[PDB]
Design a protein around this ligand. Structure first.
Ligand code: FES
Ligand code: FES
Ligand code: FES
Ligand SMILES: [Fe+3]
Ligand SMILES: [Fe+3]
Lengths: 87, 330, 330
């Protein structure tokens, strides 16, 4: 019910249980685009290095979802404990 | 201008067969046409529908003001004749001199199907086919080919309107809006064999990418089925020549009962879709969950764009690799 | 490009009120308008005249094709509705989904006065006000609002024609020329409150910059007043939508007597001012002494254009700092 995360910029922070990964990111001053803040437009797509993922979007193909290389932070989350985004 | 270069690998419809036969009293053409800003001429040379650049290699006159002579297109100015490969075979002023090797105009893949004439400007990836029309061959079905209709909108925007669900209540209240089934669903979409496929409840789409839609409406199979086939010719950056062919089982009624109805719903869309600016969809449009089809459509066109830059094999994969989202089996 | 950027800080008239009421049968609008190459839509939402960019945030339809529903402007395509702040408050396709935060369109300062609708595209310098019309509120006078008249000419050149004293003998010989007043005076011109002020004998000009002109005339034919308020709207690089309101003390005669006269004066100007090329006056025009009004006005605009670059306060100073040449007080 809590997750940390890292970057290629080294920054690291925590998603309190009431937040979207996206809101966590913005709260910590990560520039990350958004529009359909439900999982469809796809502009918030961001890339993943590590971590185990749950998708709730309707943008990523089943194969894209099964590759841990992408995530839509507006609606998706991490069930692992850490997740590293390549940003 | 080369954001639209990938479009040259696809087959595009440029005219109806009856437009070519009407064009010139000979019934062989020539007919001038414009596709992705290219100026082309179409003509029947022998048993072939031939498509060349509408510009003669000699003094740059338009072959579309010429005439078909036997199996050749004859320029109207000094009478040069061009064969089905765009090579000059007769220079009337020096019939005994050699024909310069450059005496040649570009030729393009030109094939008829479904009653329309399709042109493929760039065949070098050898991996695109003419869009799919479900109702051809099926002999239970009467097939009508409406006159082409022209919109001041792009093939992408016209495409998206034809596959749109959210807009019935507002543009087509009198003609298409079903007030009990008022709100649109989200449906799984498959990529298969270069086509998008998705269904409703029953409407079944088979959208051969980029610009063709094949819509099979059945009345829960009880009554009888109706097929709409709509394809957009990207004439230039702002314009579409749009083709609608429709087939129906129930052939006992008047063709002009349907032609008027189609005509009506198109007249309802045209002024809205033409109003959209900028004409090409910029990156600041805000979507919501009902827009799944439009987003998925744009996702794939971008991939086809990038795949094209990478080259032939990349493009073949992008277009033909299956991407199944539903339970239907292939 | 952005050499006209400073003009966005002023209030400009886009339409008469009747034009908006006439535009759509509801009498609430919407009405499309072009101001400095910007495409906008104007509508009466509740008690407010609202101005938005004429471009939906969903898929970019023109909201001017839409309809006013409640206190919102409803898009023609999928019926998103926008409140007085340009925020979408209803997405008909997913009513049980939250509206995206980017689901909004740019809104502009929009205010009615004198029977016209005014828009201010840029409010950041917060120091401009709607031009001054001397005959509003004065209950002794009968005000008339002519229909907008369009000229293939810029707002700057329209203004210079209206305050010009040197053309009467040639363009308006039989309608405004005074034989034994054939040579124009040079006059004191003051800057007050962001306005040019000057008189001539009387004729008392109060020109709120950049494009408004308020001319009071205490007739040598009456001992009673007559007032001309003319304001050019720059719709694009080459054209203006021009407004004329006039008030008169002797209110007993037909409105059309004067309407026909004004319309005839403009008819005499129009061809000549349209012929002026380039549309924007270049540096190689050679002024003379009698062009004092032309010169001071180009000078003030040039200063204002510079001031805009150096930021908010330098602009507010160039507009509002007073400069007195005559012997009057204020
Ligand atoms: S913001 Fe559009 S899908 Fe996440
Ligand atoms: S231009 Fe074609 S023959 Fe001279
Ligand atoms: S484009 Fe305006 S609501 Fe869809
Ligand atoms: Fe439609
Ligand atoms: Fe004049």
């Amino acid at each position: 019910e809590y997750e940390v995360e890292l970057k290629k910029t080294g920054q690291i922070f925590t998603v309190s249980p009431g937040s979207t990964l996206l809101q966590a990111c913005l709260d910590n001053d990560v520039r990350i685009e958004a529009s359909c803040e439900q999982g469809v437009c796809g502009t918030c797509i961001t890339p993943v290095v590590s971590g185990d993922l749950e998708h709730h979007d309707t943008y990523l193909s089943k194969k894209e979802r099964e590759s841990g290389k992408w995530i839509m932070p507006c609606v998706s989350r991490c069930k692992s404990k850490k997740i590293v985004l390549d940003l | 201008n080369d954001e639209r270069e990938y479009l040259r690998h696809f087959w595009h419809p440029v005219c109806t067969v009856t437009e070519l036969e009407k064009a010139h009293p000979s019934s062989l053409g020539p007919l001038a046409v414009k596709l992705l800003n290219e100026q082309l001429v179409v003509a029947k040379l022998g048993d072939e529908y031939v498509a060349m650049r509408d510009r003669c290699a000699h003094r740059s006159a338009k072959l579309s003001l010429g005439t078909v002579s036997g199996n050749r297109l004859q320029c109207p100015y000094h009478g040069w004749q061009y064969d089905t490969h765009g090579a000059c075979q007769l220079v009337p002023a020096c019939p005994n001199s050699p024909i310069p090797n450059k005496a040649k105009v570009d030729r393009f893949d030109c094939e008829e199907r479904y009653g329309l004439i399709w042109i493929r400007l760039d065949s070098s990836f050898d991996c695109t086919e003419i869009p799919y029309f479900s109702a051809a061959n099926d002999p239970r079905l009467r097939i009508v080919i409406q006159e082409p209709y022209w919109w001041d909108a792009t093939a992408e925007r016209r495409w998206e309107n034809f596959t749109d669900f959210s807009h019935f209540a507002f543009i087509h209240p009198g003609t298409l809006f079903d007030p009990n089934n008022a709100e649109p669903p989200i449906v799984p979409m498959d990529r298969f064999n270069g086509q998008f496929r998705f269904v409703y409840d029953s409407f079944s789409y088979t959208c051969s990418m980029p610009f063709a839609i094949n819509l099979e409406v059945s009345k829960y199979s009880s009554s009888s089925l109706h097929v709409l086939f709509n394809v957009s010719c990207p004439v230039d950056s702002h314009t579409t020549k749009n083709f609608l062919i429709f087939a129906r089982e129930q052939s006992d009624d008047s063709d002009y009962l349907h032609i008027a109805f189609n005509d009506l719903v198109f007249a309802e869309d045209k002024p809205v879709i033409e109003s959209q600016w900028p004409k090409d969809a910029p990156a600041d449009e805000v979507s919501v969950v009902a827009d799944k089809v439009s987003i998925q459509y744009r996702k794939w066109l971008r991939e086809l764009k990038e795949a094209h830059k990478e080259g032939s094999q990349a493009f073949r994969s992008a277009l033909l690799d299956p991407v199944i989202e539903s339970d239907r089996s292939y």
